[model samples]
Target chain A: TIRLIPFKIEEKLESVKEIPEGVNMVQAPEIWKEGIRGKDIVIAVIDTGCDRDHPDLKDRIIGGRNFTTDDNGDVDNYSDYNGHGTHVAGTIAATENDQGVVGVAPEAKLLILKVLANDPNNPGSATGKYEWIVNAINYAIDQKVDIISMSLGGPSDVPELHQAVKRAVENNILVVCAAGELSYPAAYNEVISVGAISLDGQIEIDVVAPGEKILSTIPGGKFAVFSGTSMATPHVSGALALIKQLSEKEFERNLTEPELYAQLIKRTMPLGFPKALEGNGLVYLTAPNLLS
Target chain B: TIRLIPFKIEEKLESVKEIPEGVNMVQAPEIWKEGIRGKDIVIAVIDTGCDRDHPDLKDRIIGGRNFTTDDNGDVDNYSDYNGHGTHVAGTIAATENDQGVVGVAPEAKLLILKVLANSATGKYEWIVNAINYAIDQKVDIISMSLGGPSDVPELHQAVKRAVENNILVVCAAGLSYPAAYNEVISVGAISLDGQEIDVVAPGEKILSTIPGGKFAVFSGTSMATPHVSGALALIKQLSEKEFERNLTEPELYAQLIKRTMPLGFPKALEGNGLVYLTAPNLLS
Candidate 1:
């Protein structure tokens, strides 16, 4: 059976030494001097797993856990041999180093929760059970991560997964996921569903991001380009980490989860897409509201 | 009694939360993904000393030296407390980070050669010594935003020595000394009145990094010189990668001229027009 495909891997390597254009398009670098580079915040990248030893990612991964069977049923083996989770983690928080790509929130910490593994039925691709993801979200909530970024999705609206996502939101943790023609978790109306943009969008996309030809880290301390709403999901997740840090600083106290969501919504710019397609448009981090 | 004043300081900003329009106007981001973000290139910011600790600039500076007595006559004390050199350095190669402003060539290495003191002034010998040091270090480009009336044969010889070494020398057209000479690429400014300028760039209210972990909006041909300086770093990387060899001074100057599009101003006013470098066809 075809499980949650997460997204598609498109393409790699020219070795981008600067902030990738995708990160630049979102304009996250502008607010960094305000001392809001997502430091002290934690984001749970709930996907396959991560290459924790990667040079750019080595220092930022605070913790990780595996719910899938990639490491022979060891829940402790959250290392990303499947490669997708490492890529997502890089987009969210690859360190600002001398010899690799810089992520959207370079200083934020990562909590890798591996819910997917190499699909046994499908030779080349990765997949996971809905129960595995459900447990990962619950784990994310228990861990009290500031954000949960899930690029995976399923066809059925699994009630158990929805409940886990709901619990995460109630705990003040923002759950971000990929939107693909009505995929589960993303379609549940509880999570912030993201869609891919060129620099383009569809589905119930809460916001669009530069999803095409996005260059990020894979396993082995290497860089590659992968495109999908899955790629877009991490951009939103990373942006929210910045927004959370910025909003809390501005208001001088921790904001309610919904208050943080409003801050994210206010930062978006309309891209002429139908409301059902692109939602609040693309996430423009330097929106005048943040400036004001 | 006269000393070399770098450039007039202008207004400041709390922080600029976006890539300043000046960087965007030159279109440096378009070719960043092509692996041409000025990696391995070294540029010498030959002016006032730099704030070696600016959050956005600390990493990009590979080495630095002072020619003036800002830190009690120690040549190793090239720290930019005067602020102009820090602003210039930021525009040229501020490290791409999660905080502060991104420079035109964020990955390019900078050799902070301090020739101007905190008084915003320096002797002719200091500027000459900085140029000679930049040549000795074999940097790819030399950016001087400071100037004065004297031609100072030693300074022009130092500038010529840099050009002979295939190092691209970039200077503000407002500087009557080294910039008035023919060997260097003297740059003018283009505001929204905008001199013997080779090309022009966004110089009005240019927001860039300053000392003390801050950002400011500065205006002058001085601000514009680094825009061209940074562009050369990008083009040098692009050409060396594509052509498989480093370009000579004349060849690089021609490539830079090719990169610009006319702004319909008189040749003396706009030169080749604004320098905007984009990657060549990615089809290959």
Candidate 2:
């Protein structure tokens, strides 16, 4: 199998040493940070669980629910034993502060869902039954979240999950998920499947992000480096939050799912790969302006 | 936080009464059959190692190499000790035969890379080290195949991994991953010392299928999953393999990756968040 690496921004920037006169830096197609401090955009993170008390995510977390066993009303009761959920959640809307890492949509509201469980070693330790995930999707739709981000996939090809995803799409809710591996669910159609990429900015992934040596907040006061498309999913989710924020303020109409998907793709960087590997190029927050 | 539940397919199909006319019945949307049938695609399973001789993956096994320390060039020497690599391999392109379970890309070729030592387990063994292994093998894509969660403020702010996912927009190599948790990354502005946030935290602790019809038991289920899913493109050598049957190793893998998906949501399944079956326009 061929693994495509990401392009390095620093290396690419090195080609141009100085800026020319009369050429506004902001005028450059690549320049300009359309800040989408994702306010008013509601993003729902469905995973093992989230650490609502984590300093980086405490205030940003609006509320939460547990789809694991049906018990546990206080979202705080759901802890990230596997430490995966907290990382995904942080990627979408972790607050900008001194406590820990910052998310893509720093100000976006978050709704955490604890679906999987972890063992003492923090490894995934749950059934991952379709019912649990489906329940979570339904709840996200009911809550009317703008974006729904999921990082799990399998080969079961469960019908319920697909229906929930369709419902979300019909409702104009943006649904993002991981891509297929040698398995099933991710391979299934219905949701957006994300792939992984390296730190050098290679197009090895779909909506690539730093999968290797990634540091994010977990359940306890600890840090770790996580990798995988699971790490990549939140980047897209956060980008959506930013887009939602931008569209809500910049555009008159609330962006539909198709519109959001189109805008996100419009702003992405073209990471070259075969048709089967990289999908629609790498995700870029600034690429949308180039279209204008 | 609100936890939305996904509905079943029978429930969805039940909702829609009439099937769209003129739709090709012989060939359904690639979404439903992704990785199920013998679509020519190749997925380089770079992991601890796979049981090349396993009943489920034997016929589909094309070739492989070992990246572990102190190993001869015996492809058969690929034995998964910790059971992580083998399970991960199975998730990507396990055979569709009746021995065990089916894979996402059944017809895709599997090129195995044993990078980490059987005894080693940690975040330190990752892409940088794994890249060297992939470069040596000359595979199409690399799946780091590992991950963990963190809560350290400084560590979380710095040393975060960033993937350039613009590939999806240009309709180049379609990529997908299953992210089921939340984590954050910090990006510093060009001028100020102040660090700014770029995107949302992806999901974590994903649960996916493993070899021998089992599910992966790892922290970054998200990390382990894409190794198989993304690598599907490598099996068929997607760029080279055009004929449906006579596909290169990478094209076969690509076919499988493009075929698989969750039951319903076209763009919200798991991995890349967009199902390959739904985007037929992407497969040029």
> Quick one: best TM-score, which candidate?
1
Q: List runs of model 1 lying over 4 Å from the truth.
A: A1-10, A200-203, A289-292, B1-284
Give the alpha carbon lDDT tens digit for every residue of B177-214 in model 2.
11111221111011011011111111123223344434
True-structure Cα RMSD, model 2: 24.1
The C-alpha RMSD of each candidate to the native structure, in angstroms, is: 22.1, 24.1
TM-score for each model: 0.50, 0.45
- DockQ for the candidates, in order: 0.01, 0.01
- Writing each residue's lDDT as its tens digit, candidate 1 over A148-266 gives 99877677877888899889877888988888623888877568888778853332556778788788998877888886667788889999999899867664557656556656755
For model 2 the local lDDT of residue B180 reads 15
Worst 10 residues of 2 chain A by lDDT: A2-11
Per-residue lDDT tens digits of candidate 1, residues B1-284? 11433444577776666777788878788868667789999999987788888888999989999887777888888887778888889999888877788889999999999887644777887787788888889899999887787778788788778877889999887748678786788788888433256678878778888888898888766889889999999988886665455556755675575456456666557655677664122100
